[PDB]
């Protein structure tokens, strides 16, 4: 809020939380990202990115080593 960053990266900040706090931060970033900042996260708890508007899946693949592959998923065409 003092010195803005054009976009954000957030590593798993929903660490030990329950559904209430993750709902708090998700609602905050939904109301606050839309006109202040881009923000991208990594998570596992489904409600946090339930509020998301786009999703980046990655599938790892076997071989001599791992090769990861990208796919994209829309989220802004769904009810409630």
């Amino acid at each position: 809020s003092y010195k803005p960053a054009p976009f954000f990266v957030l590593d798993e900040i929903d660490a030990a939380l329950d559904n209430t706090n993750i709902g708090k931060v998700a609602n905050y970033i939904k109301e606050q990202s839309t006109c202040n900042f881009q923000a991208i996260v990594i998570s596992l708890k489904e409600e946090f990115y339930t509020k998301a508007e786009s999703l980046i899946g990655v599938y790892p693949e076997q071989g001599d080593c791992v090769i990861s592959k990208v796919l994209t998923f829309d989220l802004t065409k769904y009810p409630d």
């Binding site: 881009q38 990115y49 980046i56 790892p60 001599d64 990861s68």
Partner: protein
């Protein structure tokens, strides 16, 4: 404006050139353990520039694809971002 998308070459389980999707106002990167996802953030910091230790890596010749095992993909890596801002 914001960051549109990111391009990577021969860096942390990313063989060749693959165009990562355009970034909306709030997206997310989800996947199980060991899926190779924090490395995207590592590349973000790398093209922004930061010391190697915080990227869980040393000597910065291990960052190439295949180097942690011991056999690098090549001696050659690109990383590239595109910033999108208003005014087209």
């Amino acid at each position: 404006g914001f960051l549109k998308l990111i391009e990577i070459e021969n860096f942390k389980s990313y063989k060749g050139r693959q165009i990562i999707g355009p970034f909306q106002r709030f997206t997310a990167i989800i996947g199980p353990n060991g899926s190779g996802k924090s490395n995207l953030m590592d590349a973000i910091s790398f093209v922004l520039g930061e010391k190697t230790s915080n990227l869980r890596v040393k000597t910065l010749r291990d960052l190439i694809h295949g180097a942690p095992v011991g056999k690098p993909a090549a001696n050659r890596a690109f990383v590239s971002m595109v910033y999108s801002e208003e005014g087209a």
